[PDB]
Design a protein around this ligand. Structure first.
Ligand code: HEM
Ligand SMILES: C[C@@H](c1ncncc1F)[C@](O)(Cn1cncn1)c1ccc(F)cc1F
Length: 424
């Protein structure tokens, strides 16, 4: 795991280490005093050199200049202020119905296979769930991958992400398969953009969401190319890392029996046997919130971020040249024994009440102005999904499944989290 190499270099060579990342030179910064300085200021912005390859993948345009890949502060800020409207409190409150429908459906499908003998890929099951949640909450479209639909669309998503893995971490049938998949995603975008425009044209009123603001941001634009970039941006970002985070948690909780019981007890305490989980109930799931926090310390699907150091400056006694990308890693900091006592132990108590919150040593959703706009969206959906699983099902991991990480397009479980299921 490439990130695990950076960890050893940070522990051995100090808080300022020059590295090769995605065949580019960068400097890894691991002091929490330096994490604050660069991530908490508008002065420092993203380095276009590191995000450049994701904008266009294998000669085919992918993320473009969307909310993530746009490194120029001005172009990013204009669209951020518009897209922000889709992530308001009441905007996310209106998405609670969506979070609930999909979690409930996921559980029943798993409940029908719960015999304690039938292997079920939890990585796939959670991916479909995360995909269904996003497609509706963001675009008002149902993909129903959980019900076995949209098989070609999911394949394309997989291949695209493998194409990402081959692009930044460096045979012909794959190249052919990837190029088609990126077109497919953008073609779906065009179709879903046309469905909303036809709905608006025919007089219909549509509920405010993510799609509404990414259309609003590109108002008076010559073409829909920027809108597709933002469509791709959210289709991927709004399901992928949430799917991996869920998969990591389920995998780890298979070997944490004591933790599962208090999770169940809480689930029994606040949500009981109730089918629909309300918004006010989410904030009462404090221990679940803690367990998910620890899961993100050891297994952040997005390991960190890149800032551009424009002028040669001294960081922690080490002088770094200008035009250099600064690498920041919450994965690395999460596993260093100088920030976290006994780093490799899954201990949810780390984030308990009265316990000092990590000070610039833990940033799964990043920090500052370029932090995750979908943080609350994700935290809401993963509480809802996990709470329902804890209500209804007990999981036993299939013998032979490992507990490792694969550094792919994001960080995700090595094995697809195969489990035999049984009712609680
Ligand atoms: C466990 C869940 C997730 C994690 C850990 C995660 C991780 C992150 C991190 C670390 C960043 C910074 C990226 C960078 O600086 O290169 C980010 C930004 C982003 N996230 Fe998330 N995220 C998740 C959930 C979401 C979801 C559900 C959405 C979509 C609804 C979302 C959409 C975005 C977008 C569009 C950006 C760019 C924001 C901006 O720079 O203005 N993510 N994510
Ligand atoms: C994790 C990461 C990612 N996902 C899929 N392929 C490549 C990636 F880098 C992501 O940050 C998305 N993401 C953010 N919050 C949740 N998910 C991202 C970053 C830059 C980008 F140009 C596109 C992009 F999708």
């Amino acid at each position: 795991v490439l990130q695990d190499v950076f960890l050893d270099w940070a522990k051995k060579y100090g808080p300022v280490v020059r590295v090769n990342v995605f065949h580019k030179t960068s400097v890894i910064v691991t002091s929490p005093e330096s994490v604050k300085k660069f991530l908490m200021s508008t002065k420092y912005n993203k380095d276009s050199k590191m995000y450049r390859a994701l904008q266009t993948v294998f000669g085919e345009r992918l993320f473009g200049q969307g909310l993530v890949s746009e490194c120029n502060y001005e172009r990013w800020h204009k669209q951020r202020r518009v897209i922000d409207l889709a992530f308001s409190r009441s905007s996310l409150v209106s998405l609670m119905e969506t979070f609930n429908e999909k979690a409930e459906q996921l559980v029943e499908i798993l409940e029908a296979k719960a015999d304690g003998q039938t292997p079920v890929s939890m990585q796939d099951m959670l991916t479909y769930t995360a995909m269904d949640i996003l497609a509706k909450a963001a675009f008002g479209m149902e993909t129903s991958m959980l019900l076995g639909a949209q098989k070609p669309l999911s394949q394309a998503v997989k291949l695209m992400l493998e194409g990402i893995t081959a692009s930044r971490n460096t045979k012909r049938k794959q190249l052919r398969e990837v190029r088609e998949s990126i077109r497919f995603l953008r073609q779906v975008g065009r179709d879903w953009v046309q469905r909303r425009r036809e709905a608006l044209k025919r007089g219909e009123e549509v509920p405010a969401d993510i799609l509404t603001q990414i259309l609003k941001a590109e108002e008076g634009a010559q073409d829909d190319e920027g809108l597709l970039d933002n469509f791709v941006t959210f289709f991927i970002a709004g399901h992928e890392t949430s799917a991996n985070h869920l998969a990591f948690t389920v995998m780890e909780l298979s070997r944490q029996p004591e933790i599962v019981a208090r999770l169940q007890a809480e689930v029994d305490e606040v949500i009981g046997s109730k089918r629909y989980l309300d918004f006010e109930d989410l904030g009462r799931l404090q221990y679940l919130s803690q367990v998910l926090k620890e899961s993100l310390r050891l297994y952040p699907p997005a390991w960190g971020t890149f800032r551009l150091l424009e002028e040669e400056t001294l960081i922690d006694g080490v002088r770094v040249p200008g035009n250099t990308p600064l690498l920041f890693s919450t994965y690395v900091m999460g596993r260093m024994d100088t920030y976290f006592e006994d780093p490799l132990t899954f201990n949810p108590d780390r984030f308990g009440p009265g316990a000092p919150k990590p000070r610039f040593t833990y940033f799964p959703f990043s920090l500052g102005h370029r932090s995750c706009i979908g943080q609350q969206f994700a935290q809401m959906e993963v509480k809802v999904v996990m709470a329902k699983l804890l209500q209804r099902l007990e999981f036993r991991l299939v013998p032979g499944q490992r507990f490792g990480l694969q550094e792919q397009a994001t960080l995700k479980p090595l094995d697809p989290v195969l489990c035999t299921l049984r009712p609680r």
